[PDB]
Amino acid sequence: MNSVVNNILKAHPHQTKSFYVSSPKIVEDLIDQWTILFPRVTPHYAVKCNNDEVLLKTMCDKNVNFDCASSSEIKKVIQIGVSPSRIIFAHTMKTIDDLIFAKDQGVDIATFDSSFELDKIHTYHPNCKMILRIRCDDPNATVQLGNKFGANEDEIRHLLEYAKQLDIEVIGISFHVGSGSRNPEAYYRAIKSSKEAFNEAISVGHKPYILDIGGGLHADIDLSTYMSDYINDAIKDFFPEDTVTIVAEPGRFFAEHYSVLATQVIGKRVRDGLYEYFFNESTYGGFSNVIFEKSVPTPQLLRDVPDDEEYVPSVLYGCTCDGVDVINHNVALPELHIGDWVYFPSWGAYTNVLTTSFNGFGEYDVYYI
Amino acid sequence: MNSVVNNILKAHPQTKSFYVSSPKIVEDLIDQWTILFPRVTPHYAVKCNNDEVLLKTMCDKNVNFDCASSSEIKKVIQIGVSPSRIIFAHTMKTIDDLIFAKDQGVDIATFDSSFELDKIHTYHPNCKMILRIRCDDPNATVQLGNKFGANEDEIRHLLEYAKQLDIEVIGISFHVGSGSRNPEAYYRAIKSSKEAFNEAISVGHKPYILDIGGGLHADIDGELSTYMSDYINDAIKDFFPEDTVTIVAEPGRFFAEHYSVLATQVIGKRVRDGLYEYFFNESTYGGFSNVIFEKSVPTPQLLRDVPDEEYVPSVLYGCTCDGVDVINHNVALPELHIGDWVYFPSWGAYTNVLTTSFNGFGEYDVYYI
Numbered sequence: 001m002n003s004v005v006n007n008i009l010k011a012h013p014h015q016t017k018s019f020y021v022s023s024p025k026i027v028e029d030l031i032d033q034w035t036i037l038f039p040r041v042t043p044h045y046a047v048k049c050n051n052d053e054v055l056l057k058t059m060c061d062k063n064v065n066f067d068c069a070s071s072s073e074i075k076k077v078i079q080i081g082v083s084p085s086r087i088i089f090a091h092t093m094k095t096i097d098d099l100i101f102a103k104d105q106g107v108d109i110a111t112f113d114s115s116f117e118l119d120k121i122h123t124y125h126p127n128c129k130m131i132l133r134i135r136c137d138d139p140n141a142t143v144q145l146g147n148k149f150g151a152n153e154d155e156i157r158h159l160l161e162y163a164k165q166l167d168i169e170v171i172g173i174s175f176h177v178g179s180g181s182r183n184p185e186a187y188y189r190a191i192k193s194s195k196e197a198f199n200e201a202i203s204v205g206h207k208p209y210i211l212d213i214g215g216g217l218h219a220d221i222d223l224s225t226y227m228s229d230y231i232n233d234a235i236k237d238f239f240p241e242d243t244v245t246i247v248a249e250p251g252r253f254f255a256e257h258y259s260v261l262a263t264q265v266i267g268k269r270v271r272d273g274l275y276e277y278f279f280n281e282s283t284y285g286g287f288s289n290v291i292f293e294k295s296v297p298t299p300q301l302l303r304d305v306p307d308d309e310e311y312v313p314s315v316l317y318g319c320t321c322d323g324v325d326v327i328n329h330n331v332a333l334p335e336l337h338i339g340d341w342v343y344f345p346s347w348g349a350y351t352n353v354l355t356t357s358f359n360g361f362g363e364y365d366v367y368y369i
Numbered sequence: 370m371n372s373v374v375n376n377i378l379k380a381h382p383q384t385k386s387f388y389v390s391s392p393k394i395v396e397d398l399i400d401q402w403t404i405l406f407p408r409v410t411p412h413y414a415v416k417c418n419n420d421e422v423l424l425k426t427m428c429d430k431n432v433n434f435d436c437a438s439s440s441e442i443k444k445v446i447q448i449g450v451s452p453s454r455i456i457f458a459h460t461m462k463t464i465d466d467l468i469f470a471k472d473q474g475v476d477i478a479t480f481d482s483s484f485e486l487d488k489i490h491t492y493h494p495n496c497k498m499i500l501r502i503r504c505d506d507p508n509a510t511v512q513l514g515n516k517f518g519a520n521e522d523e524i525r526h527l528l529e530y531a532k533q534l535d536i537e538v539i540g541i542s543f544h545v546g547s548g549s550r551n552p553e554a555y556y557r558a559i560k561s562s563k564e565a566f567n568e569a570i571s572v573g574h575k576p577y578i579l580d581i582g583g584g585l586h587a588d589i590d591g592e593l594s595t596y597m598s599d600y601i602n603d604a605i606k607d608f609f610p611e612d613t614v615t616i617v618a619e620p621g622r623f624f625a626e627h628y629s630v631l632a633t634q635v636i637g638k639r640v641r642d643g644l645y646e647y648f649f650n651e652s653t654y655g656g657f658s659n660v661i662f663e664k665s666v667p668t669p670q671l672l673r674d675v676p677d678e679e680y681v682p683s684v685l686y687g688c689t690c691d692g693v694d695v696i697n698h699n700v701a702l703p704e705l706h707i708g709d710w711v712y713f714p715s716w717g718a719y720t721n722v723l724t725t726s727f728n729g730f731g732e733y734d735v736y737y738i
């Protein structure tokens with residue numbers, strides 16, 4: 001990667017904007033790994049994590065399906081050439097106009113966690129196949145989702161009965177333990193709770209057949225099987241039947257390693273032995289994960305330094321006016337100079353999708369390799 | 370405002386959330402600025418709200434501009450504003466933005482580092498420089514001191530370095546922090562600015578500008594409070610009484626805050642054990658980033674008329690799949706229904722400028738009144 005980025009810089013000597021270097025082949029290999037790690041689980045890629053059109057086309061061609069959060073994401077996927085039959089509208093709160101659009105296009109599998117959402121379905125998309133999302137938290141997940149989404153255990157039966165009353169077909173149960181989960185027991189407990197909800201749905205008179213284990217998984221490479229082995233044990237313990245279809249909604253598993261982000265030192269200040277640098281990127285650009293996921297990322301220098309190069313205490317600032325916009329508060333690095341380029345590895349998940357134009361910055365290029 | 374917004378809805382039988390923006394309000398505030406600060410020329414901080422009608426209103430009312438980047442300079446230049454009315458008030462500017470500023474005739478900028486002076490000498494040697502010193506309001510909403518502004522112990526060195534490079538230092542600036550209600554902070558900052566001003570004279574510069582930065586609110590109770598302006602003017606009298614000194618400021622929120630209201634619709638609802646949870650077609654990743662970055666706890670105004678009606682405990686959620694995305698965790702309101710519109714007053718400062726398209730949301734309209 002150090003070589004590739006350096007070659008891009010030499011081939012494009014007038015490069016000024018920060019730039020993503022994205023590799024479809026990385027994602028292809030990871031899709032193949034998913035197939036091996038989770039042989040029973042059909043991935044519905046969470047478009048919200050990274051909606052890069054080459055990434056989505058790569059997914060499409062590898063027979064990966066899609067989790068869309070809005071009508072805009074549905075449109076993106078359809079424009080790639082994917083059948084709307086391959087989309088789960090996996091957001092429990094959908095606008096009436098988005099529901100009408102989904103019905104029209106052929107997106108007819110969606111999630112819910114409220115009676116009012118069932119009312120909307122009844123009126124606007126009456127034959128949409130529904131998946132009840134239940135709350136099952138991983139308390140150690142990086143981004144918590146439980147307060148806002150998912151039915152509590154005590155309303156499961158009521159919601160299923162209400163769906164039955166409105167002639168709404170409930171076809172399965174989903175959960176999301178939280179974004180950025182490394183807790184295998186959380187998935188085990190979630191899958192157990194899902195079987196209990198599945199059994200309530202059957203009791204009410206539904207004929208469910210889908211388990212949706214949501215997202216949260218990292219592709220941790222040292223590729224580790226701690227998460228997958230235990231998830232598969234839970235699938236075996238609670239959903240052994242070949243009549244059940246299992247799906248997932250991974251975002252970061254595929255998107256994380258898709259891209260690196262290259263950025264240039266544009267300003268510098270050295271005070272009492274502390275080396276402060278300003279980059280043509282920011283927490284309002286590609287680095288929102290510093291704010292929302294507590295990321296503390298270390299860059300790779302593109303300039304070669306000797307093995308014995310002295311590291312100095314460094315502060316990596318974003319380019320905006322704001323004091324909150326600090327990429328890394330403290331990191332030991334070789335001394336950098338205005339004009340040096342660095343890159344941040346594994347910068348494809350919840351990075352480019354969260355860009356703003358705050359302060360008039362936020363621009364970037366994308367190179368595919 | 371309630372009838373105005375209802376009128377827009379009746380006139381546009383409208384799906385997206387929308388800003389209702391009033392140039393008159395800003396024109397009136399400009400007239401008030403001239404009364405509150407008769408000696409201070411405002412350079413509006415474009416970053417706060419870059420709406421084109423707002424910028425044109427500023428232009429026509431003889432207000433100047435504080436631009437943070439080349440993109441922002443472009444926005445101002447393209448509406449016919451003389452480059453002489455722009456200060457490039459960012460202490461860390463890319464070489465290519467300086468090149469651009471030089472091309473456009475933007476010939477005044479701030480700095481707080483020796484490396485910045487190196488860049489100026491090489492790329493914009495005619496640029497007149499304003500030294501930004503660090504002077505904090507510890508009670509300001511958004512702190513800036515950590516990241517920007519020269520420390521007291523380096524002021525003389527920085528001025529001597531500019532002199533060695535044949536760079537003209539024409540003044541001193543500070544920013545106590547964004548969202549300041551501490552008059553003492555400004556008094557001390559202006560006192561410190563006069564000390565720096567005298568150091569500049571001692572070194573051989575001929576400074577003539579004091580730039581008091583931004584931070585101020587237009588706090589109204591239909592009369593604007595002078596709690597800040599009176600003491601700022603007192604400090605000006607004490608430390609910069611000379612008519613040979615030009616005083617400027619870089620206000621953002623003072624003019625932008627009250628420029629707009631943001632209307633948004635209830636798109637989802639869930640009532641659980643007496644708690645009323647609502648989902649809106651807006652989010653903290655759309656126009657409500659101030660909930661995250663400024664710890665805003667905004668209360669909406671209902672557009673539907675209610676009888677002098679029981680209030681219930683309500684939670685206002687944003688439309689994204691993130692658990693962080695909560696507009697207001699707890700607010701007492703009359704019961705709302707899917708389809709109800711509400712609006713949020715004084716929603717013009719750091720609101721529309723910070724929109725993302727995360728989850729495929731973030732779209733909005735703008736109506737001018």
Ligand SMILES: Cc1ncc(COP(=O)(O)O)c(CNCCCCNC(=N)N)c1O
Pocket residue numbers: 046049067090091143145176178179180181214215216217249250251252253288289292293350690691692
């Ligand atoms: C329904 C659904 N499916 C799949 C995923 C996928 O989760 P992942 O960890 O990528 O596999 C998510 C992500 N939940 C909001 C995550 C916000 C993260 N916000 C942020 N600013 N980084 C989701 O809501």
Ligand SMILES: Cc1ncc(COP(=O)(O)O)c(CNCCCCNC(=N)N)c1O
Pocket residue numbers: 321322323414417435458459511513544546547548549582583584585619620621622623658659662663719
């Ligand atoms: C040089 C300069 N001038 C004027 C202003 C104007 O400040 P105001 O309070 O609007 O008058 C600012 C705002 N400082 C970064 C503001 C980040 C706020 N961030 C956020 N997420 N809201 C600034 O940096």
